[PDB]
Amino acid sequence: TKERFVISRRRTGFGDCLWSLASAWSYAQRTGRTLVIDWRGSCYVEQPFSNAFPAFFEPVEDIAGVPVICDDRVNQLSFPGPFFPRWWNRPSIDCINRPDEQIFRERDELTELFQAREDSEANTIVCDACLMWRCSEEAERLIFRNIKLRSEIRARIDALYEEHFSGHSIIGVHVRHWADSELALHQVCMAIRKAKALSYPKPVKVFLCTDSAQVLDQVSGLFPDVFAVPKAEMGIEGGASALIDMYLLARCATVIRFPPTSAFTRYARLLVPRIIEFDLSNPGHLTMIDNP
């Protein structure tokens, strides 16, 4: 009997990477395979063959009974074929073209595979598409509980928690990405107003996570007690600030998701008591979700 694998490849924001990790993990568990975390080519790492996982998380060899390879051994080990999806059996010169069409195909093919009663005969499953929603909520939670941020990142979360969150009830706001820009700011303000009108056991502050300096300035000038985390190595720092925000969001009493399609706030969605978002099914109208 030879070792068999599921490789989780993702290179986008960490919420996407970690959700998609949970999906790969689940299939590995179900089918008795070893999980490979392959974050080579991350948007946060300049060096294209460096596995980014260890740059942000501590080494992990097991997650809930599933053996894990999370490091630069991806550059040394030859994972065995046959491969699923079947595209991965093609010669590498034929694998240079990898358009979105193909990637979406694979998401679909992995989705039916994960739903099928029979394990695949392939020795290695290559997961290299978005696998958000392709696992249980428990699978996602297990991931978050069983990997650990690098201590330098934790130290920063810990300092900011003590400095702003301790003793307070924090409303977290994630805003991602002229009538358009004006409308969005209006909408964010409407959301904050709703969040602020709820009752909290401690004095309220607003924790804003946005990539826009304009939004930070405007939201801060429009509400009291608004704060945000300040400030190759810049890729790493970009990744670290993302994680700091993602994890602090999950310590908030209420979180506003703008938009609620973003995996950035999925972890908050799992942990936070109250979520506020604009309704997909009913546009322009705020809705509130108590957890669950």
Side-chain angles (χ1 to χ4, degrees), residues 157-168:
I157 291 160
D158 295 347
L160 295 158
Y161 188 79
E162 164 65 10
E163 288 151 2
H164 304 288
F165 283 67
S166 165
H168 297 86

Side-chain angles (χ1 to χ4, degrees), residues 2-273:
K2 305 182 194 184
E3 198 176 351
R4 305 194 324 145
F5 305 85
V6 183
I7 303 176
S8 187
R9 317 220 323 123
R10 210 79 189 124
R11 301 171 294 287
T12 46
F14 293 115
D16 188 349
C17 297
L18 295 169
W19 202 336
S20 297
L21 185 56
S23 297
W25 176 89
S26 173
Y27 193 70
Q29 193 282 140
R30 188 196 281 137
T31 64
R33 298 172 183 262
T34 291
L35 174 76
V36 180
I37 311 175
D38 177 4
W39 288 3
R40 287 177 295 180
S42 176
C43 58
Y44 297 111
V45 175
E46 186 176 36
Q47 300 76 12
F49 315 123
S50 175
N51 197 343
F53 182 84
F56 305 100
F57 299 86
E58 295 186 343
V60 56
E61 294 81 36
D62 181 88
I63 293 169
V66 175
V68 176
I69 296 161
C70 72
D71 63 17
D72 278 344
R73 286 173 288 168
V74 300
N75 288 325
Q76 325 162 14
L77 298 172
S78 294
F79 299 114
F83 303 95
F84 185 96
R86 290 184 301 178
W87 188 92
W88 291 85
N89 296 310
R90 307 201 210 288
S92 48
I93 193 57
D94 293 342
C95 290
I96 300 288
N97 188 34
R98 197 174 163 73
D100 285 3
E101 352 182 290
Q102 182 55 41
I103 292 173
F104 302 157
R105 217 166 278 120
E106 290 185 29
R107 173 199 57 209
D108 288 349
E109 295 165 355
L110 291 161
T111 296
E112 36 161 25
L113 182 70
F114 293 176
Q115 259 126 246
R117 74 180 42 86
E118 290 185 338
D119 182 36
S120 175
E121 293 301 275
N123 293 144
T124 293
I125 312 305
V126 185
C127 296
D128 198 353
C130 187
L131 292 190
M132 285 168 50
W133 305 103
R134 267 53 184 195
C135 67
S136 71
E137 187 193 307
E138 283 72 42
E140 298 173 75
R141 294 186 190 278
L142 261 163
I143 290 309
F144 277 106
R145 283 178 65 82
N146 292 281
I147 67 184
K148 194 159 172 182
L149 286 165
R150 278 294 170 182
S151 70
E152 31 281 291
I153 304 179
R154 289 193 277 98
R156 294 170 60 189
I157 291 160
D158 295 347
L160 295 158
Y161 188 79
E162 164 65 10
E163 288 151 2
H164 304 288
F165 283 67
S166 165
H168 297 86
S169 280
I170 310 305
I171 292 172
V173 190
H174 178 232
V175 185
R176 190 174 75 184
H177 220 289
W178 304 115
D180 252 276
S181 209
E182 186 169 305
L183 181 65
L185 179 75
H186 184 57
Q187 291 186 334
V188 169
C189 290
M190 293 308 268
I192 291 172
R193 290 187 187 118
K194 181 176 178 70
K196 284 195 79 180
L198 304 175
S199 81
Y200 296 93
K202 301 168 173 190
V204 168
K205 271 102 180 97
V206 178
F207 172 57
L208 180 60
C209 304
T210 189
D211 59 18
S212 181
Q214 310 185 221
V215 178
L216 189 277
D217 289 342
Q218 300 176 146
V219 174
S220 305
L222 281 167
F223 301 89
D225 305 314
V226 173
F227 73 97
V229 184
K231 93 180 177 227
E233 283 142 14
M234 213 179 311
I236 296 290
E237 177 53 36
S241 335
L243 289 165
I244 288 162
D245 281 349
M246 288 177 25
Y247 277 68
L248 286 169
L249 281 168
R251 308 288 332 257
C252 293
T254 293
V255 171
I256 288 157
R257 293 184 85 187
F258 204 85
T261 49
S262 164
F264 194 77
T265 46
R266 176 60 172 183
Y267 184 46
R269 168 64 186 84
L270 295 165
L271 294 190
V272 166

